[PDB]
């Protein structure tokens, strides 16, 4: 069944009604039961009914705390990032750096004439990503697609322990402007994400099926030995960049999408992605997760040499969800295989 749905594993779009829009975990458990987990990405977009603000002309003031410019080094398709943390500045501070001559977007014909200059001045003339910002856009009584509270099972762990994870189960902010990027990953113990587009320039996506994750890896691991050999999972460190050329050039499986504002991109579990923005924009996002999570969850291989890395504790996850395997579990016995061509089990109301 599974098997058969998206085959090419590509980035699938969807157009839900409004009655479709408003149950979030519903329409999550529907694009799956379609296959869209199997790209490890997909564009929804909202009613052109809906808006999740009035207005955005009001933010020129909110503080970016912790701006970070980023340095990349590297040539041939293959590059390391580095963050340079800046002063605090205010978003009319960024906007007018982001728009600046110096930092403006390129002028071109179609998308990928910017793609290609991307990937040529990366390493030149480093941009400021006012990433990290703690906070929403949304309006306190948008209830659809809220990202501050979307109710899914990752509620579970603020509801047990009473942790917060910032930008994990509570929202983030990014600012971008040209040139700006996020290395190739996937979310913290393999969660799912949501990427809200609130306004300006597109953001380019890449994208690596679950089911071909470990073949980046694979290949990522022999590019950086040394970084292989001093973490079991460096690329949680979100610093690693990889042209889509290079991938091309060793055989692994991706596709490309661009999101444009008022558009929202979900990640699934193990989702590589990667991509950067076009100019001066504003994205929100955070974590989520479903039921078929909670065994990534339990597999997802952590970043092994920092202290300040992201652990969920799955105890509660799999006493509530998978009782019957939790002694196993604990002994070190459970075997369970992952099949990234399954939907999440609350997708059996539409099989
Ligand atoms: C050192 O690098 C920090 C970083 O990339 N953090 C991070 C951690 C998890 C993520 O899901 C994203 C992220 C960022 C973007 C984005 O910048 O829009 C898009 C998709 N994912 C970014
Ligand atoms: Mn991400
Ligand atoms: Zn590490």
Same mark, same amino acid.
């Given at each position: 069944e599974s098997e058969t749905l998206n085959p090419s594993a590509r980035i699938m779009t969807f157009y839900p009604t409004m009655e479709e829009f408003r149950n979030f975990s519903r329409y999550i458990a529907y694009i799956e039961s379609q296959g869209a987990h199997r790209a490890g990405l997909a564009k929804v977009v909202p009613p052109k009914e809906w808006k999740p603000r009035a207005s955005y002309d009001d933010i020129d003031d909110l503080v970016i705390p912790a701006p970070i410019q980023q340095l990349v080094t590297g040539q041939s398709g293959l590059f390391t990032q580095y963050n340079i943390q800046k002063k605090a500045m205010t978003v009319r501070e960024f906007r007018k750096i982001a728009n600046s001559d110096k930092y403006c977007t390129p002028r071109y014909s179609e998308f990928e004439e910017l793609e290609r200059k991307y990937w040529k001045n990366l390493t030149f003339n480093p941009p400021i990503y006012g990433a990290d910002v703690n906070g929403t856009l949304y309006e306190k009584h948008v209830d659809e697609w809220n990202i501050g509270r +979307?109710?899914?099972? +990752?509620d579970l762990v603020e509801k047990e322990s009473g942790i917060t994870i910032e930008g994990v189960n509570t929202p983030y902010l990014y600012f971008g402007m040209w040139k700006t990027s996020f290395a190739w990953h996937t979310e913290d113990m393999d969660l799912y994400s949501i990427n809200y587009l609130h306004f300006g320039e597109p953001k380019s996506w890449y994208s690596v099926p679950p089911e071909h994750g470990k073949r980046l890896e694979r290949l990522a691991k022999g590019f950086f030995p040394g970084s292989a050999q001093s973490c079991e999972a460096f690329l949680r460190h979100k610093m690693t960049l990889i042209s889509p050329l290079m991938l091309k050039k060793y055989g692994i499986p991706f596709d490309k999408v661009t999101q444009e504002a008022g558009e929202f991109m979900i990640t699934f579990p193990y989702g590589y992605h990667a991509g950067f923005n076009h100019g001066f924009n504003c994205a929100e996002s955070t974590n989520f997760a479903t039921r078929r999570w909670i065994e990534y969850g339990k597999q997802a291989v952590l970043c092994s040499c920092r202290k300040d890395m992201v652990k969920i504790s799955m105890d509660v996850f799999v006493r509530k969800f998978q009782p019957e395997r939790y002694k196993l579990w604990k002994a070190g016995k459970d075997n369970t295989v992952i099949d990234h061509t399954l939907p999440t089990p609350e997708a059996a109301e539409f099989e």
């Open positions: +979307l109710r899914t099972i +990752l």
